[PDB]
Write a structure and sequence with these properties.
The structure is a homotetramer.
Chain A lengths: L11 E11 L2 H11 L3 E5 L3 E5 L9 E5 L4 E9 L2 H14 L3 E4 L10 E5 L5 E5 L22 E9 L2 H10 L3 E7 L5 E7 L7 E5 L4 E8 L3 H13 L6 E7 L6 E6 L5 E6 L12 E4 L15 H5 L22 H5 L5 E2 L10 E2 L6 E3 L1
Parallel strand pairs in A: 1-4, 5-8, 9-12, 10-17, 13-16
Antiparallel strand pairs in A: 1-5, 2-3, 3-4, 6-7, 7-8, 9-13, 10-11, 11-12, 14-15, 15-16, 18-19
The structure holds calcium ion, chloride ion (4 copies) and manganese (II) ion (MN) (4 copies).
Chain lengths: ~350, ~350, ~350, ~350
């Protein structure tokens, strides 16, 4: 029900950074810098600007002290300065609230447009950014769990096909999705930069931010993050994983920051840059779709996500999903999942895999 | 209490091989050869003899066709031919049933002694064995999931302290254990070869065999086994993991063979060869003790294990544990576990970690 | 010297495949399939078509039996069917010989244009290709040394600035290069797909093909290839490496096929897709520019490369480089390199690093 | 020939630590702590005591300030206090200078015996040592290049068979060696703890210490050390590697400390604990014996080694090797190596492999 505008879409390069509001800046710094080893581009009493090992733009993450923890903006870099004008014209045509700042909303970004998008999400588009020392060969700084790139965002939204269509018009190409035999869509992944995704839609009450994902070079780097969290005795902040994804084929881990913002660590998905890249649809009941090894998806993964803010700094109202619930149809009392389609052996009914029930 | 014999203990080098009775030989071959990549030393219509990548003795695993799936023998290599005589005298003094075969019980083993030990387990002791091509540099054969060494056995027995004393007198040294503050021992690990263990005791109804473990070179090799099992659509045969252990500090995975014999894949524990190697005791309520990342221990891991045979080839009667159950005290309805000792935050009452309950 | 056409450049997606003429098809099959584990998309008595683990187009490599080993075509996929017409007009304006086949030059490719480009190289441009099973999750087929993508080509040409300009007009963006203070350019790297490169120019006598490069997931995959070649007693076919590159930051290995075609295995370079991606220029005397650890560059690496064919199947005549030779200025009798610029300690004069002279 | 004492050999557990005299304690600290990440057990302005990640004894390396860089002591831990008496009796019967100190020669070691051994080397034997925090699960401290264990020493001595016999009488078991077809032995490896070696003999002018080796968990940890040294622009202190060894099958790297003391980093050799462990002999001309991939051995690796001290703190006089030189017979002007025995193809005459001569 979101029409394709006459105005041309801005040419989006990739996800570039997220601005997260955090309640205790010191505790957040402890998590992102001391635990996760992100690199400080700038900090003061209000904000911490962080980047990954291979990044040359000013930052991939802004942490902003605020009264209520929430996503403040998810930023995409566009190809040219003129693409910021294109973004403004596009979202104006859609009837969305927009705000333009010629000198940026955060440090290290220039001319930028923020919008309350049709799904209620605060998107930023920008070209101009302050270049910093690209640390990609600074092996004197490299940590055993080094986060090397920002990879993607993931958004919770009640109507997946509605948001998918909107993002396709915006230029994202769908790479994978999860549906059932009766035509319900539960999740979709879509890209600009030639990886599996730059953002993704998870069916649920929204708008809420599901997670922000960073890449490592190798699988052992993700293992080290888990190991380090056990050593720091904060294993209760490991939410889910580590595992191999079905959708995306990436090795992964989900952890929780001090304000319960979910962060994914991700590596080794595949190239999607060709225009006829084959799309892959998984059945919702396929127990290898989210964790390839069949490990159960923790219930909080389906229920918990971050608030998002409007352009005034206020929390967006949550709209309830009316389509079927992935949690309910797979691990709920009347849910089921299979290892091999049509096989009772290795299937789970009314509970999760590996012998667990929902707590 | 099992008395310490006057006869000297045999000098045991290491665990060497296990003989498992299996019901369908071809199906077992698929698992151990096609899925796991173990190397065939010899096979016929009745048995398959298998060895790991770096082994020079004839085999690390014998699969024997039989009516009832069970452990037939856990075999330990001894230092000299004379240590077989020492083993016979020692077990005779213990009042155990023993059987001596100068030409072995299985192919590729010479003079051998099998015993029904004081815990009801069929142990074998041998020195003589047919050497085979050591494949340790045969990288033309090397699998992405290559199993490189046999590492240990793990035994389920109802009275851990009783068994621990007997194994210590036999010359095994305890490296780690799990106890509570009320005097109960739930598990013990013990070695000869200078890794964390060659065998271990897990509290539970017994005698039953908990598992046999093989090691890989690197953590990615264990990940590959998981990935391959996903590709073969047999993820339902992944029981638990992959993870990082607390006890042993090893990276691990538990999988189930066609007869539900449990196999662990293991890597990167530490050196224990010094005689004053510090013994580590974990509290049973410590949620980082079995999985360091705090992932829940699947209930089947605590309840399921293989039958074992006596020397007549009949299943040993099972004696029920009367000591407290690790399952019940940690993940049962009256259970408890913590992330940080003395912290209510990150503790679990009457359920498992990460949002699950007993299925 | 090469003027920019008024005709619009074809939109090039990425390098896609190379066709190499080989003298003994069975011996070449042994190397690419049995040693390297590439996947067969088609074969007969004259040709083998091969693809990497994550590929969905028909092939990344075609081996064609012929009398003289040579590069027959380096192919790039274009974005649309219409881009093939654009490519034809473009090279026609450049005065280049073109050949258009509506049904393709090799199996699994449709409408295609081959050209003898301004530097004498046989380029192919195509859109249409037969999709095949994408093996990216086929872990039951995954080799310990699995080649996962085709990454790039590398071309030897006598005048690097002349070639660079031509490739820039064609849409390729320079990411890194090697120069000296006197203004000679020795090599340049350039991309379309958002990695360090899709092709590269290496100063030397040309046209010759320096190498075709495939990527692995992890560094250990590359180490396995070396280990395997050791076990096969073909370590003499390991030309150079393994190492870490300075330029590109990739972990790497160079090996030689039966006809001495050079293959690079490559992993873990960085993202270059932003239009203002920072260009990196290294000094030719920096001993960390090619191997980051300062290991010496094998002289054959600088002197040997494959013949290339014209459109008639005849070898292209070679034109000698008149600019300074990288070998001569770094490892030759009158050459030098440094570890730290301006520091004589860790410098090498008239010989290579690590105590070696030219053989 | 060194006679076999009537007195029993001390039961040696393993190599335990080395004491190296260094000329600038601060510069050595930067190398061993800052670059390499070893853990400080104790330090003052005269000495730094260092241990590996998984160690529980007080230290694996003592750096002692002094006027001439040299080995002061190579220490082996013995099984019981009584074994220190046995070692004293054993070396006294050998006619060797001994010194016994009930309170140790260095901090954190108790009753200890130091000897000037028959080959001129300062050996220490001890049981008593101060236990420290075993850091094996301190992943909060874990470096991307983490050194996890002390693995072995390597000694340069002119007469290898002479030394080998002495070490065998002492209880070391030979695992691998290098010989030629004319009866010359160039090197031998021997163990107590069940890895390939605890010490080794390299033929050359001696006594000199060739190197001390530390283990990592995985091959990428060794890669990271190289990468870090490149980032620190100290790649000139990488002497040789990284590589795969033929002998030992271990992945390796050799680096040089501020006083040119050689340190090897080493991982993933095999189990040798069985008393009939198959002994492997390589031919000296086999180009895969030292580097399995055929990479050339740096001439400094054959010529350079550390001074060793006597018990009075004076440099031991060097005795020249009269047997053939491994350098000369393989990579010298009159040397030879092969890839495949008997095959001229892939062989090297009067030069090193991969296109190099000696600089
Ligand atoms: Ca209690
Ligand atoms: Cl997922
Ligand atoms: Cl466990
Ligand atoms: Cl290079
Ligand atoms: Cl060596
Ligand atoms: Mn994600
Ligand atoms: Mn185990
Ligand atoms: Mn290349
Ligand atoms: Mn060594």
């Amino acid at each position: 029900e979101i029409p394709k505008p006459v105005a041309p879409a801005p040419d989006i390069l990739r996800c570039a950074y997220a601005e997260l509001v955090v309640t205790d800046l010191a505790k957040s710094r402890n998590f992102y810098v001391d635990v996760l080893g992100l690199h400080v581009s700038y900090e003061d009493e209000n904000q911490i600007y962080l980047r990954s090992f291979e990044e040359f733009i000013h930052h991939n993450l802004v942490l902003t002290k605020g009264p209520v923890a929430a996503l403040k903006a998810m930023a995409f870099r566009v190809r040219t300065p003129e693409d910021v004008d294109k973004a403004e014209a596009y979202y104006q045509e859609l009837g969305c609230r927009t705000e333009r700042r010629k000198d940026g909303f955060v440090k290290g970004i220039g001319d930028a447009l923020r919008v309350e998008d049709p799904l209620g999400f605060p998107y930023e588009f920008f070209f101009e950014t302050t270049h910093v020392e690209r640390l990609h060969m600074r092996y004197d700084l490299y940590s055993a769990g080094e986060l090397v790139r920002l990879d993607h965002f993931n958004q919770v939204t009640p109507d997946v096909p509605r948001g998918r269509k909107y993002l396709e018009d915006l230029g994202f190409r769908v790479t994978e999705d999860i549906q059932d035999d009766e035509g319900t869509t539960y999740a979709a992944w879509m890209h600009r930069k030639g990886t599996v995704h730059d953002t993704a839609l998870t069916g649920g009450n929204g708008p809420r931010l599901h997670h922000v994902a960073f890449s490592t070079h190798e699988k052992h780097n993700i293992i080290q993050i888990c190991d380090k969290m056990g050593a720091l005795r904060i294993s209760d902040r490991i939410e889910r994983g580590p595992g191999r994804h079905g959708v995306s084929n990436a090795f992964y881990l989900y952890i929780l920051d001090p304000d319960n913002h979910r962060i994914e660590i991700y590596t080794q998905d595949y190239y999607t840059g060709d225009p006829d890249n084959p799309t892959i649809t998984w059945n919702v009941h396929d127990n290898q779709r989210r964790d390839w090894w069949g490990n159960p998806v923790v219930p909080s993964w389906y229920t918990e996500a971050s608030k998002v803010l409007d352009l005034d700094g206020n929390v967006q109202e949550i709209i309830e999903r009316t389509d079927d619930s992935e949690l309910e149809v797979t691990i709920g009392a009347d849910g089921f999942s299979f290892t091999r389609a049509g096989d009772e052996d290795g299937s789970y009914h009314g509970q999760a895999s590996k012998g667990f029930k929902l707590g």
